[model samples]
Target: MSWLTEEDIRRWESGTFYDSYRKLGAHPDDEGTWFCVWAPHADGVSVLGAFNDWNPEANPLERYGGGLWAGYVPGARPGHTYKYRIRHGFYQADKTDPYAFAMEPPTGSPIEGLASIITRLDYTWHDDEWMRRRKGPASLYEPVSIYEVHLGSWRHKRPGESFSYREIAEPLADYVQEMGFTHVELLPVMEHPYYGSWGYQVVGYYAPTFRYGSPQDLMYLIDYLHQRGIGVILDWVPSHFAADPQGLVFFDGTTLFEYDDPKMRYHPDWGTYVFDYNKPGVRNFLISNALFWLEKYHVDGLRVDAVASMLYRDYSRKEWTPNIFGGRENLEAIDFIKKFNETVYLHFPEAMTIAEESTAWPGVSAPTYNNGLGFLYKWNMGWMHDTLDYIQRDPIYRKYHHDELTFSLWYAFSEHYVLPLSHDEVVHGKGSLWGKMPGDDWQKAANLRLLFGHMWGHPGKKLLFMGGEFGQHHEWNHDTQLEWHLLDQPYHRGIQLWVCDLNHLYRTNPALWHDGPEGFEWIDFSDRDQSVICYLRKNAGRMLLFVLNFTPVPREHYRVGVPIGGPWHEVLNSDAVAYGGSGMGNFGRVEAVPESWHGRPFHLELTLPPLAALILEPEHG
Candidate 1:
């Protein structure tokens, strides 16, 4: 008998043809068939389950080609729970299944009278028309009001019960959409055995967790959002697998099944088995899994988790390992990732795939053909971290670090990406965004308002977790539910409306939406006596002027030059009464009365309140 080559393994794993025991092959017209297992290391393989008698002798599987063994029975269909008993040289026997899609409850039980299931994929989609919309320049809103939640704990916790997809869809959807966000990025929904890993430890790559609901239930939730015209992105973990031996780990009784070199395979920090991307079979499995979610669930995009780990050989490791070329490029991993991104984009052109690479990998979002990493977008982690640090400081200290706010503009010019205050930053000892502010209640609110204004004022797409929109008071806890009742307070509600208006302004103004070569220009910045930053967004006839006052005291007569000749309207103010702030703003329009003070352009003198942001748009005649 010939040993299986890598190409053979790839072909067998592709699910293109039917085999005797494998579901990839064509189904036999006849019923009641015998299924067998093949393991050269095993002396015998027995079929034991509810379908078969508890006695292994009653349904013993016969050995065939070399190490191959099988048994036959009549009337064995899916849902006939079962497991295989293998006897390996001098060892008695233990039950397991290499290709189990859904495991029995309690995770590690091998009770008799259960059979393996054969599932058929069937779904009726209602959003076929909605899928036809072409990908256009997204007027992305970064409200930073994320509601980090676990579906199981999002609702009131109860024993033996979890929140169904349908049960939580409407409420969560209503809250996020009403709160004003362009997209809702969900954490991993992939099936896993343990609850503590926060969906990062994936076992079933293609299957949604049955703990939440059925596959159809998840589809319903996606369709519900599509009906509301909201984009959805899922956190995808393709870098590693759970440590569960019963899961994908060593499924075929060999480390070569899903990984390479057990020592080099496991993630040191995460205790998970890293994939052997060098293997064609593993590459196909992961790439196909990504396509399955987008095709089946109608997801708008995928946020590839821990991409830095996937790209580097010595991820989270202080020591380095030598590769074939004596270099540390992790060439195999990089090649596999490029192929994965290419295939995903080729199949799903409308879908957006983002990479969470923190190493400042240049051109991670650039197209692959352009000698780049071939991702649709990469998270701007630098901007988020640096800007957050700058805004949480006193006004006096901002002058020294004023460059932090302006430094990101250079990076923004290089890549098209999204700025995210993701769950990772707030979960551990990092503390909540609101808690990081530098003052009392009033000062805190002011600081928060200023920070948000700065985030919106900057260019690029934006994303905020759920609770961040309403000034979530506590750090995110995946085990507990989000503090939804906190919105009842006036302060929280004010922040919520502030986010709503920010999104509205972002969508309505052309300068913010059109982020091409002719997008934004910094008008002025004052680091002397007053802390103020001003910028203008201009495209043809449309122009928007944004001003931010970082100081505690209000400026009575502030002059910011504008290109528009005629008049400008006060489109939005952060301190408006409707947004739960002391109303200290002009009500009507301001004619750009000509002034000789600022070179060629006219300057508008306006009153700017402390810790507030204002947007002024030109009025067309």
Candidate 2:
């Protein structure tokens, strides 16, 4: 009997099968083991390994109609290594299983070690409350503060050893929780031979890299974070894969996985083969891979990387063909992506997905039913770009470009956006967040604090790359850990403490990240000459006043409008001496007067600090 059912065959043939990972990959059972591979053009196929003394003919697999070859070995054990040897006319080639869960280390020969069958997962879970609450999907209104991380280099090990998932779980969870991050977004953890890719170019879609321990080790990491009430988001790359010879490059001695056309086959930017997302089989492979992470590993979200590449056929080059509609868009890939997002919430209701799209693609975070791409959130690349550009200019030049600071308000609610200062901004000599500032040592640190304050107070979710909270002065070096020793310095320590306090305030106040039509309102956007901007955030009776001064000149006795006539407390001042600022700001409290200013009945005069953000809250009776 065949491994797949009649329905499975129909779907596979029709190119709509999404659960292929479950049946096609290595599956170990008490009876022995089962294996299946796709080799449509092969003349003959056989399973070769230590199970049959590395002899192909000894364990031949029967071909099923859809170019699928599968077989069960009653004597095969869990750790037995194997490869598929295909015979086509006068030639035969040895290749690893595309769907295999684990792979052995490379050796002298390209096909030295083969795919290994994965043992069953037996790790117990302790995050029942977290899981129970997560059964329902996240709403845009929920508080989201993400801490981006790279697994291999977020922190390193002793001379010759690295941290196991179990060893890292406690420290990671505690740190995230203490820092008050709502979620931890890890870089790709899928199996890849090239460490330099930083897990971006994946090889084994079904297996976690064994370098970190077993697949269950990763499960432990997620479970621990969930138990601590911290959600886990994984960086998923469906844009492309590593073109390793033993990988999905030329399985079955044919272009079985990538595009058939050379222009479509080779990605000009990465020099790798792009998955023919137009093909049903390839779509199923990617969609199932997404679901596998959500269902099997209990991942809460996926931060889809390089989304621009996936959405456009002509990404990174103008030589590519246009879709049938005669546009630059890739219609086939668009269909695949919509289906990918739709299936995630269908199979796992709690899961959420994000897009790292840089283009002006409309409806990227909207639901498919509304003619959208079905992503819950999209990284606000525009905001990052504009804000960074604004901050990098000399303070004197900031007045001329004041619109850059206020322009995001124009489309802040266009989609559920996440203001991100991701790893991308810090790598490739882009310099650290501090380095991007145009000032002396003290001024740079102050500017960074102000930038973060603006980010936290902005109308969107927040994401910060590692080491950002503490003002690391060097560009990100993936080979080493962050400058942990910088904490001893007052400026760095102050930045960290400010981040912690800011997180607490943001989490407690629903008005900060909310946008209920009345949630956010600009009190004054025309204060261009002073280089000062004022805004108000509202949540029911609670209201917050945010004022930002971009110039290095302080505005003493500066007055801004307040929503209510009451005592306003300076809850957070980026210029506080404790935060390594010049200690120039409004005192602990200021009462609003009935005098009208900026169209508000109540106004408060304040000492505005240069290059700082001030958050004022109305004290409740």
Candidate 3:
């Protein structure tokens, strides 16, 4: 019997065909289990499982054209674990199914229950409202505060038990809600052999990692978050793949999956196999993998990882070969990324596609019709680096480097940017958000609060790593949970509470997100000697004047310009006593003077607290 039609073979060969998984791996049908693979180099391929007592010759497959092979067994069914045995030119090898939805384990070789068939698995998603509203163009003007998370170590149940998919969903949903975060950006969940790589070295591109639970269980996880009004963005790795033996390496004894040349095939920094994007089949596989999560699991977005490596041929290599165009740019790879992104937006118009790119590649977040890659957002790596550098320096020295604090604004609005304090910033020896500050315990904590206030008030979308809001004191450890005990302390708890309040205020004010530069104006940012800066954010008639003092010395009765004259009430004080501050502020409100100052028609005299920020609104609430 014919398992696949000629049209299927033509599409697969043309590299335009996705869904090869439907025909390649084990499938249970009315006839029985259907086994297929692409192994043209093999003299013969057989389906071997425990049900057949590991007999290699029991179920032989027919070699259809285009390197396709297929066969069906009458008695075999789903839930049975299986592997393929291939005899290629006197070289024999047993390989795991690359397209398998489940795997035994990277930890164990001859393990059962993994590579298990996708039997009768089902889940009822209850996120219809969120799914309906997310089907159009994503609004850049909306309030977007992303809470980036590494799922494995975000939280643990108890001794000898980690949080499962079902267990993690509800609790994380509630916490994300409590924090007033809009979305949860999860690290890559693709199946990988190495646990420590943190899901970056992906093997099963189409499958969710079994370390959490079944595919249905993962579906339930996304469903729960959606029901709570939180969007889920999956971290996708199209830059490279893991180098495991039975993986895509030397599959069919040919360089079909990867490139034929070692220089182009390997990634030096990641020690992994780089995918050959030059091939149509490889591009189709990756594009299909991206749409799979969106279509089946109902993911809200995809933050493509390490995008710089994909766009450049000499990404991290020394003396590497150039592309045929004689330039550093990987022409084919760039085209593939554009195709991948265009396909995603065309199929799912409202879905967000973000790039974690650090290079100054123009038009990363621009429209594809304008010769761009068509991502909705690009992580603002330069802004984070500049702000963190300025925040960690001595207050006295900060004055000398005042330009560093305002340098990012020179081109802040060039692309749609997400100001990220991501998992990358806190990992390794770089230390946590609080540990990066320089001073005594209280001063350091105060600096973090000031930095956070500055970030929330700045332009672009916001993203803070897990443990950042609560002021995690140590560097992030992927193997263990965050220092949850720190919340018991006053300083840590205060930081967390402050962030919650900031979120509420940020969401309520359209000036923080809408109307572009019309919503923001700098009164003065060149105060180097006093280390003070003042700005205004306005939307419609409502406005907020921000005065920031970066020194430990208080500037009592400090005068700053204001556009309108009225009873300017203090809406938010970063130095509030409740938030572990010294309680230095302008009582409750300040009356603006008629005297003109600093290019404004009106002015206000206020007591600026040491290392503090003040948000003064013209009208009383």
Candidate 4:
């Protein structure tokens, strides 16, 4: 019987079919299982499964037009593992199902789990209210604090033992709630053959890695997080794929899933196979895979990884082919990115699309209608680097590089941005955020607290890698859990408390997030000799004053300009004694002087603690 109709084949061929998985993978019924595959270059194809004792000749498939093949196995059932034996010209090989919903875990040395399992998605969801509310445009003006996590390394039930998706759900949800994070951005969960790659080398686009239990288990985790009022943003890697032998590499004895040109086929930095966005079939497959997660798994957003590699032809390559206009841009890949973003937004407008792009690509977060890439947000990599550099230096040298802290304001409003302290910063022997601070133990802790406070008050949403909130002292290790024991110390526990308070304050104050394009108003940034800066975060008529001291010497009776005349309450102070500080503060309130100063109508004389940040709000009249 015909399962894939003529219209379906036409749509798949034209790259317009978003639900191609339904017809491409094995499907089970009461009578038997129906297997289908696309291999235009294959001379012959047959099903090989445990049900048929791994016999290739027993279930030969009939070739349909447009490189389609199909057959029926009466005894083939769900939970049965299978592969396809493909013959091309004079060469033959067994290939895993690209659209399989489940697979065995990836083994390191032998590279096991080459076989795909026949399974069905039958999980019932209990997040109707959450799903219903997320039906329109996302909350762009709302306060967003993302806690980025790598599930494998976040926690462990025992040493050398990782927690499954289902096992980690409750604790993760509870901790995120306590920390006041709005979303949890997981590293790529798609099946990869190498555990050390940390899910970057994706081999299964449609399946969740079996190392985290089954697809249903992942669904449960998402469902649990949703019920706890948390949004989930998944890391998606369409820029490249793993080059495993049983993967998309040389399938059907052709570069069916990758670029045909040898130079363009391989990614030097990642050592993986680059997808051919120039072909309709390849583009259709990727677009379909992206939609599949949002539609099937109910994820809230997709943060596209390594977007720079997809936008340029010579990226991380010594030699490369130029586009038709003799430019370095990959025109076809650009079109594909636009198409992907447009299609995703069209279907799920409430869902966010973030780009992890480092270069100064104009309109990286702009709308496609105005010659933009149509992403909802772009990671502010420049801000991350500049601020980290400034904070790492000794307080004496920080005065010479004062511009590093204030330079970000030059174009802070150019695009929607997220300030990310991601896994990339703490890996590859770069050391952790706490370790980067140049000081004694107490000074380092104080510097981190001040840095985080300044980051929260800066213009943009916030994202912190796991273990950063509590100040993980060592570089991130993917094979093991974070140093949870550090929290026993007062300094580490204080950092966690500080972060929790910051998140709560951020979520409650509209001035911090709902401000217009010109949200930041500089009070003073020229006190380089003293290493002090003050600014205002404003929204409508409301405002909060920020004063930061980067040195160890406290500035007693320091004067800072204010816009209004009233009793200003100290909302948060990084140098509070409770947060492992010296207990120096302005007694919780300061009165603004009527004298004009620093282009403002009034001013305040106060004591600014060393290596501290103080946020003050004018009390309501």
Candidate 5:
């Protein structure tokens, strides 16, 4: 008897089969194992594995129509490695299973080593409390401070050896908890043949990369983090797939997974194959893979990678086709994105779907019914670019580029935004965030601190790449770990301490996390001559005043406008001696005067330290 029902066949053909992974691929039961694959164009298909001495004719599969071929092997069981041997018009080749739960790492010949492993996903989870608390959807009002990580380079067992997912769990959880990041966003952990791609060029969408360990090992890591109240967000790539011979590039000797048209099939920049979103089977595969991560691994969110490429047909391509409306937009991909987002929310309401779209796409974070792509958050690339450009300039030239520091506020409320200083900023000859600061050692640290302070005070969620908090001096390398030893230095240690303190303040202060126009107001952004800016963050009658001095010259008795008339306490001063600053501050308190200044009823005479930021709170009662 066939395992799949007629209804299941219909759904799989219709592209609405969200759980195709369960019925397809290698599934081992008590009796043996069942192998199912999708190869509609194949003349004949067979299972080739060590269990049957790698004989193509030993276990030929029965054609189930609608691109499916399946058969049962009583002697074949879990732990056996296998591949599908397909014959299409006298041309035969062994191909890797797209729905395989585990894949062996490449070592020798591509076909020999990159075989699929028959395995069962059985893990006892202990994240009941975390899952229970995550029942409701996330809100813009909630705090979201993300620490982006690249697993292979995050840490190592030795100089060259990387830690397994299980081995890295405890230490990673401890560090994230200590550092006070709400969530940890891992660079794509999906299976990729080339390690240099940093998991972006994915081939095995169904399996986590074997380089980190087994699927269960990754589960342990996620469970460990969830128990510690730290969320895990996996970077997912749906825009393109790797061009490895054994992968989905040309399955069944046909362009089954990618577009049949060469112009639409290839990604020019990356030498990868763009997914054919118009095909029903391809759409089913992608959506099922997205849900599999959340359902099986308990990932809290997905940061969809390279969404701009998916949205625009002409993106990074010299040759392209227009849509039915004669527009550059990829209408099929847009519809698929909306469907993916809607389906994800429908099943896992608490799970977030973020878009790494760099363009000014309207309503990116809005609901789909409102003509949006339906993402919960979009990376604010403009903010990152402008802020980095402004901060990297010399103090003398900063005054002229004042607009770069203030322009983000004009469109700050356009979408639910995440101000991401991601790995993209630190790689490809672009130096580390700390290295971007221009000054002497002392001044550089101070400038870095001021930039971070301003970022936290800004009206958006925050994301910092690995090694940025402690100020790693080198550009990011996928081959090596972060400069962990840098923390031994005083300035680096101070940056870490300052980040910890900022995280504490951000988490504790509701005004900082509050959304909408009421959450932020500029007290004085027009002080370009002094290269200084002042702002206020407000929520529920609570307020935090921020004053930033961009120059190296400290301003003594700098009068900043305040809404309340009372003693204003310096909640945090980035220029404090503890954070490697020059020890210039307002002595922890400054009383406001009744003099009208900057359109406010009260003003405080403060010492704004050189290249520093100060967060002030009015003394209660």
Candidate 6:
């Protein structure tokens, strides 16, 4: 009989037991090694894949208690495919590795059905210089021209037809960088059996969709973008798991880890098993998954999906009102998220994580030490929904709901966030951004212009779905790629230029990028009759002032106050001819007026076009 110390038990319990099989073994001597997964219910687990011929009986896993099972295979190396076989019911079951950093082909795509392979971490990152070139407190350009796509469906049609990550990486990176966006956010890349789930129903948490290419191919894509100075953010779903038996659900045969009741166990809307974050194994799996992407993929950030579901026990549909913990808060999920974020920052300080939480979860982006959720940024869903609602309404009605546009300032002051035109608003009968407008084509264009102006004028970071930039006409469909031919049209081309100029202007101007608790000032937000909104973005030595005309009628001489005592310049106009407008508004030029109006401020009297936005900056101060 062998006696094990508490330290030995703890080490064994930590899931490193699997590391012994690796050639170099556990945390590699020269280079670091990582082992990860998301099995909260398994009584025991074993790593078996191409290396082990998918044999569950031959390679039995040793358990360290608390539902975690681990084994180490030295010389196992990256690019060696693997899956976990867990004890369940009458037989041993094979399940996708939840912590697989990269997956083999076919498991990822039309390539589906092929044997799974491991993804090696190897790349010559040229972005180190680009990263150094970036200034502090970066001004993010949320290019509204997002192209919503499903990797599996985007290219896979007939059998044998597929697009690799390497094949798409160059074009995708070139297109976005040429479009002048600061970042491109991908939908979930995790491995899932169903194409329609949109990567949300993840089985392999660590594996990149094997369909796209190898894990290294995804890394190559990121590296290429970084060299171009474009940031990459990936959509991540941690709130739920696929109910597939071969997945994490019921891995131990008994419903030992998930919610006890079927009613509480499933998300009625999504048909997925809600995670039992209260369990330590569950916490470790999710936390390690988050770290895996940052450490292994070298991704810039993660956009956590369905955060609202994670934050509250009763998410969308209300059934059981009685609190699970006797009316106490569901601290398990919250605590897991906090610790996960803290761990992420500890491992990779530069990585940014955003939450897709629609509910007003206070202090979501605030630091964990402050007793708050520790995301670096949160989605400004209220602002997006309200602004869209306001812009889509008739001009007369807009005057009344103008407060919707102005009211978001309250949430803006709460924390750092990104203003996103996410896939949610464009798919499933919601319609495209332009389709949401309340009027005809001309009015729709005007409304879009107004929305763009407001987004650019606002203080927070911004993200736009792919087609939205050039005013994509139809709602997004997961089955088809974006309407690439739309770029041939003049109107769409103008929208592209409008987005490009917006990115350049936002990056160049300090005021647009530098406003917040420390550097933002609004001149006239309460004016209803004027339909005028004016704000200034100032940071360090740079200042930018923006004025918006929400009405349908153009004003020849509008007077707006400026903060800096210097000549102002008209930098950008959403209605410019370059953006398919009549070019009625001011072409970017410098203004020299010393007279003060509206309380000792630099007043610039200028003509503003109907349904237009103007960015004014200090030319020489």
lDDT of each: 0.67, 0.82, 0.81, 0.88, 0.88, 0.67
Q: What TM-score fits each model?
A: 0.85, 0.94, 0.94, 0.96, 0.97, 0.84
lDDT of 3 by residue, 462-514 (tens): 89999999999988888888889999998888888888878888888777775
lDDT of 1 by residue, 1-621 (tens): 322334444454452211212322111224754454545466676766665564577677765543445566565554455566666656544444443434444343333222233333356877766687626223232222233346765654464455688887887788767766767788888766667677888666666755666667888988887777667788898888877654555544554435444354554433225787765456655776777787868888888878888776664445355555456566777877788788777788868788889888788888788867787777888899888888878777877777876778777767776778777877778778777777777667767777777777777677777577777789877667667687788777888888888877766555676444567887776444477778876665678888888877788877778776777888878877776677877568787758743443787778898788888887886
lDDT of 2 at 118: 44
Model 6 segments beyond 4 Å from truth?
A: 1-92, 101-115, 118-127, 130-162, 260-272, 315-328, 563-566, 587-596
User: Model 2 over residues 1-621: C-alpha lDDT tens digits?
Assistant: 578777877887788787787788677788767778878888888888777888878878888867788888877777777888887777788876767676665411343554654456556877788888975355577678999998767666763355788888888888887789999998888877776678888778787767778778889888888888899999998988888776787677766788774553555533326688876678878887898888788899998988888777664555555456467777788888899899988888768899988788999999998889999899998899999999999998888998998999888889888999999999896889989998888888888888998898788889999899899989887778778889999999989988988899888887775754567888999987878899888865677888998888988888898768878899899999999988987786698999989999989999998888999988886
Candidate 5 segments whose C-alpha is farther than 4 A from its true place:
107-112, 262-272, 315-325
Kindly give the stretch of ten consecutive residues in candidate 5 with the minimal lDDT sum: 263-272
Q: Per model, how many backbone clashes are there?
A: 28, 0, 5, 0, 0, 32
Which residue runs does candidate 4 get wrong by more than 4 Å?
106-112, 262-272, 315-325
Tell me the lDDT of candidate 1: 0.67
Top lDDT hit: 5
Q: Which residue pairs clash within candidate 3? A: 103-114, 103-115, 104-114, 104-115, 136-350
Error of 6 at 394 (Å): 1.6
- In model 5, the clashing pairs are none
lDDT of 5 at 116: 85
What TM-score quantifies how close candidate 2 is to the native fold? 0.94
> Model 3 TM-score?
0.94
Q: Which has the better lDDT: candidate 2, or candidate 5?
A: 5
Winner by lDDT between candidate 6 and candidate 4: 4
Judge candidate 4 at residue 619 and give its lDDT: 94
lDDT, candidate 6, 1-621, per-residue tens:
112234434543463332212211122223322333334455556667655576665455554433344454545555666666666545666655555555565564343453345545556676677566533122333222233344554444344454677777777777777766777788898888777778888877767866677777888877887787777778888888777665667666655336554543555433336787765555655666777787667777788887878877664445444645343246777887887788777767767788878778789888898988988778888889888877877888777777887888876868777788877888887889878876766667767866877787776887888678777889876767666677797777877787777877766555565436666777778668767788877776777777898887888867777655656668787778777776876555556456775554577877888788887777764
